[PDB]
């Protein structure tokens, strides 16, 4: 699921920094600026991988800082479709089961993905399972459970940019699949 | 004070359309025509781009077609598609 992407940016180093060697300061500043945030075309950023090249460090008039342009590589969470994944549950819903990878949580298993036999619960939100001969419609999925196996089947970016003159859902969502044998709770197999 | 609404009403109205078997055939022919423009080389779409991964399915579903060439004696010798 992890992917590596190349980037470029301009970094301002405020003047009391000048003691420490530059490369370290730019690395810190980029991690500060970009870490733990999501880009509209490449997903969720983890941290920078390395810095490839550095231009000259100008000083613009009217300011003490030094501006530098940077070429750098950053590792980003961007799972592609049909990847097999293991992840804890985080909550049931009528429209599906929410799953969590710990650092990320916007995974939904819709009921169409669930196995045919089980369609709804006894009015309790904890999703139940059913099966033909054994498992007489009594297994159910705990809201955390184990790291169930599932395979991604859909994804989307949704924009959240401001609209109109100035003066909560995450911009990324995934859909998983559970139907195929060997998936779900490990105890089943 | 209030300016008029963006659509002021008009007393006259557009005259009823003429219809008939010939006109129906014109309409159907126009539709059929629209369909034809989507199934020959002259319908230049953007060349396919941006594969995600080395999906094993790539072996089978790949679209196969001969390279379109016009007869070259009618055109300048400058724009060969190779």
């Amino acid at each position: 699921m992890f992917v590596l992407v190349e980037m470029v940016d301009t970094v301002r180093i405020p003047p009391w920094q000048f003691e420490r060697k530059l490369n370290d300061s730019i690395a810190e500043e980029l991690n500060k600026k970009l870490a733990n945030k999501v880009v509209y075309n490449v997903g969720l950023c983890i941290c920078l991988f390395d810095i490839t090249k550095l231009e000259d460090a100008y000083v613009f008039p009217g300011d003490g800082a030094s501006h530098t342009k940077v070429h750098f590589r950053c590792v980003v969470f961007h799972p592609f479709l049909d990847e097999i994944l293991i992840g804890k549950i985080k909550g049931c819903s009528p429209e599906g089961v929410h799953v969590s990878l710990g650092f990320f949580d916007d995974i939904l298993i819709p009921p169409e993905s669930l196995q045919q036999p089980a369609k709804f619960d006894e009015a309790e939100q904890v999703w139940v399972w059913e099966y033909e001969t054994e498992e007489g419609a009594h297994d159910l999925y705990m809201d955390t459970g184990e790291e169930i196996r599932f395979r991604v089947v859909d994804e989307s970016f949704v924009d959240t940019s401001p609209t109109g003159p100035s003066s909560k859902e995450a911009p990324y969502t995934l859909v998983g699949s559970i139907s195929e044998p060997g998936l779900g709770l490990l105890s089943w197999w | 004070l209030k300016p008029p609404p963006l659509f002021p009403d008009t007393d006259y109205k557009p005259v009823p359309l003429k219809t008939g078997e010939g006109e129906e055939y014109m309409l159907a022919l126009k539709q059929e025509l629209r369909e034809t423009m989507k199934r020959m080389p002259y319908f230049i779409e953007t060349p396919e781009e941006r594969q995600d991964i080395e999906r094993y399915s790539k072996r089978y579903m790949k679209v196969y077609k001969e390279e379109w060439i016009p007869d070259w004696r009618r055109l300048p010798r400058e724009m060969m598609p190779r």
Partner: protein, 158 residues
């Protein structure tokens, strides 16, 4: 041109309803006579001669049925007939005052007898855009953006 206005100026309106209904009556009656001519297709020379609806005879047809009790003799009738001769209800067949009854009086047969609408309506008129009072405006992305022309919206509905 005061109280006179042509004696049709009764009610100080040109008596619009009466002038228009009188013109419609003349038109329909001369249609009837030209229709006798057309139904007979009389030896075409005489077909068009009978399609010369004699407007002295029209003048005598319009004094009666109680229509033109008001001033009628030539002048006032001739001029209202002429009000009908200023459009596509008519076309030149007067041949001066000497051929026909005083030129069939201003040519009140001329081509009332027919001149069928040279051509039918026009797609332009039979379409919203062309009929839209507010033209111009309607710009790709704007208030009257053609993507809402209620005229169309309606023409679409109907």
């Amino acid at each position: 041109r005061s109280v006179t206005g042509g004696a049709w100026y009764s009610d100080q309106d040109f008596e619009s309803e009466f002038v228009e209904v009188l013109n419609q009556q003349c038109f329909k009656f001369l249609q009837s006579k030209a229709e006798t001519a057309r139904e007979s297709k009389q030896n075409p020379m005489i077909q068009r001669n009978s399609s010369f609806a004699s407007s002295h005879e029209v003048w005598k047809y319009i004094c009666e049925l109680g229509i033109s009790k008001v001033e009628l003799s030539m002048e006032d009738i001739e001029t209202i007939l002429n009000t009908l001769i200023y459009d596509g209800k008519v076309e030149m067949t007067i041949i001066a005052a000497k051929e026909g009854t005083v030129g069939s009086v201003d040519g009140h047969m001329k081509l009332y007898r027919a001149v069928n609408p040279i051509i039918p309506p026009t797609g332009l008129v039979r379409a919203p855009c062309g009929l839209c009072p507010v033209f111009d405006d309607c710009h790709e992305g704007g208030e009257i953006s053609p993507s809402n022309c209620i005229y169309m919206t309606e023409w679409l509905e109907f």
